[PDB]
Design a binder for this molecule. Structure first.
Ligand SMILES: Cn1c([C@H](OC(C)(C)C)C(=O)O)c(-c2ccc3c(c2)CCCO3)c2ccccc21
Ligand SMILES: Cn1c([C@H](OC(C)(C)C)C(=O)O)c(-c2ccc3c(c2)CCCO3)c2ccccc21
Lengths: 136, 136
């Protein structure tokens, strides 16, 4: 599909919030552990994401995630418009690696690493880079 | 140069710590505002970075940044080996945009966005994506 389409959602583990972004065209994932499931966190995350990738449109499974003024401000400034089982796979790898790390965020980043590097025969990271490069 | 070489340093503003990573071959920047200039923050940042890009070697202007056990553990797990004026340009853009945002971290991410999108005639983001894709 379009190379600038992303998907953004939050999942929960150990009473903590995990913000997950998926480059739909590729399956590449970015994730962060946030204290509160607030629009301020979502907006800051969006700013980080747009400065790194060409983000055209963002989809979500909880539309109310994108109603706060802070979120709309972030999408406005970065020129972003609104528009899986990835949470389940990521939760799988997280469960697999959880005991190697004290904090949940470390295991989250470990799982992101594994998922993006996994070969399927390019990997998710290779796929996102190649799609965005080709589009150039 | 080699597409897997990164540069990592911390700068200071408003009594806060900004961790800055530069993809040397391209000039692409990632940055985060951290509470303390500790090895734990550096290690977590490195885990995030390696899961997103093919990180082979990391250089720094403060070698003692990479002596903590936590840092070496992160480089071990991700398979990372040790080995500008970007801080000044980034500080420039940050100064330019600082009044549009309440928090420093928002202005930092704004500056990262501007720098990575700036045209020079591809941009830094386009360059990193194209280098890493070509290397594929
Ligand atoms: C607290 N802590 C952690 C780690 O937490 C941070 C990443 C935030 C530092 C955590 O939650 O277990 C590490 C550590 C660093 C790297 C690393 C791993 C664990 C596991 C996967 C591979 O990479 C570590 C090492 C020596 C002392 C203390 C440590
Ligand atoms: C506190 N706050 C912020 C912003 O802080 C966060 C990003 C952490 C939310 C800050 O430091 O000024 C924003 C805001 C959101 C997006 C955005 C900008 C500012 C400026 C550049 C373009 O993008 C915002 C909006 C409505 C109410 C409160 C706000």
């Amino acid at each position: 599909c379009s190379p600038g389409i992303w998907q953004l959602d939050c999942t929960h583990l150990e009473g903590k919030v995990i913000l997950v972004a998926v480059h739909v065209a590729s399956g590449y994932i970015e994730a962060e552990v946030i204290p509160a499931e607030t629009g301020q966190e979502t907006a800051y995350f969006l700013l980080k994401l747009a400065g790194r990738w060409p983000v055209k449109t963002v989809h979500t499974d909880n539309g109310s995630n994108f109603t706060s003024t802070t979120v709309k401000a972030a999408c406005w400034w970065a020129g972003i418009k609104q528009e899986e089982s990835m949470n389940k796979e990521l939760k799988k790898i997280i469960g697999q690696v959880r005991d190697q790390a004290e904090h949940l965020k470390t295991a989250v980043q470990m799982a992101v690493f594994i998922h993006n590097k996994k070969r399927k025969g390019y990997s998710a990271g290779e796929r996102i880079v190649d799609i965005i490069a080709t589009d150039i």
